């Protein structure tokens, strides 16, 4: 319900009947040097995975969170 | 997102210019503010960058040590100011929102210029 | 720095054309290369991110297309909204690099 997303990277309230934090992560050219993109949000269904991404949804709040 | 930049500056060699570049309806933080001149008829040349979350400012090797790149949250203003204008800085300025990617190690740049200003044109002649 | 060079310096097309616009790049910047318009006395606008994708209001008739040092970018059906220099800046490197500019003129 109140759980962290990627592009301001902040506890932001997730929307009514979204109580999903996804971590999407898979590797880009550099994953060599940097690390899987990391990527927070919010959902109502752990959202889908492709080949490489790689996803943890928590359901409590402000549990969408980074590596330092 | 809106980037609203100074006005005309006429200057002398050897003076200092500051640019201003404000930005709006945007998280100023979670963006990185850079600058690009384009000289009269000429392409357009990258002069540095500067994430506020970080602080610090990448600035390219040319322009270095005359460039210097500041923001001030207060104001959401970004500002550039090179030094030692010579009569080639005859050229507009730009001040362009560049997104942040977020990768494991760190929040890092990604080198799209989504947003860009109305230019600044600073015109160097004795 | 990795040098970028727009093929199509100059390209007259009439609006009932399809045009595309070659940049190469001198290392492989791989997805990383993004497109731009810039009319004359108006600041550059990004048409193109990450090679293909299309930032949200771009008319689809511009389409990217390439990977490695070797990229396009079709504008489809030219309309005269869509006649002026194009630029393509990599995004691998911190010295962000630009091409000369491609202008678009109309085929008289």
């Known amino acids: 319900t109140k759980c962290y997303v990627t592009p301001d990277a902040t506890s932001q309230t997730c929307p009514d009947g979204q109580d999903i934090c996804y971590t999407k992560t898979w590797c880009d050219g550099f994953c060599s040097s940097r690390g899987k993109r990391i990527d927070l949000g919010c959902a109502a269904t752990c959202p889908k995975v492709k080949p490489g991404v790689d996803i943890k949804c928590c359901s409590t709040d402000n549990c969408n969170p980074f590596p330092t | 997102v809106q980037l609203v930049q100074s006005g005309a500056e006429v200057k002398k060699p050897g003076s200092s210019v500051k640019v201003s570049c404000k930005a709006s309806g945007g998280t100023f933080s979670s963006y990185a503010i850079s600058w690009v001149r384009q000289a009269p008829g000429q392409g357009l040349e990258w002069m540095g960058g500067?994430?506020?979350?970080?602080?610090?400012?990448n600035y390219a090797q040319k322009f270095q040590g005359r460039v210097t790149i500041t923001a001030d949250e207060s104001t959401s203003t970004a500002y550039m100011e090179l030094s030692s204008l010579r009569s080639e800085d005859t050229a507009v300025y730009y001040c362009?929102?560049?997104?942040?990617?977020?990768?494991?190690?760190?929040?890092?740049?990604?080198?799209?210029?989504?947003?860009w200003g109305q230019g600044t044109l600073v015109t160097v002649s004795s | 720095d990795i040098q970028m060079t727009q093929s199509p310096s100059s390209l007259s097309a009439s609006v009932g054309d399809r045009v595309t616009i070659t940049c190469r790049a001198s290392?492989?910047?791989?997805?990383?290369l993004n497109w731009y318009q810039q009319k004359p006395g108006k600041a550059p606008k990004l048409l193109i991110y990450d090679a293909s994708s299309l930032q949200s209001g771009v008319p689809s008739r511009f389409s990217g297309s390439g990977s490695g040092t070797d990229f396009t970018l079709t504008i489809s059906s030219l309309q005269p909204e869509d006649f002026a220099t194009y630029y393509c800046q990599q995004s691998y490197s911190t010295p962000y690099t630009f091409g000369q500019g491609t202008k678009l003129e109309i085929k008289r």
């Open positions: 290392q492989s910047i791989s997805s990383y």
């Open positions: 362009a929102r560049i997104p942040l990617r977020w990768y494991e190690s760190g929040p890092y740049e990604s080198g799209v210029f989504d947003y």
């Open positions: 500067y994430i506020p979350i970080f602080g610090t400012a």
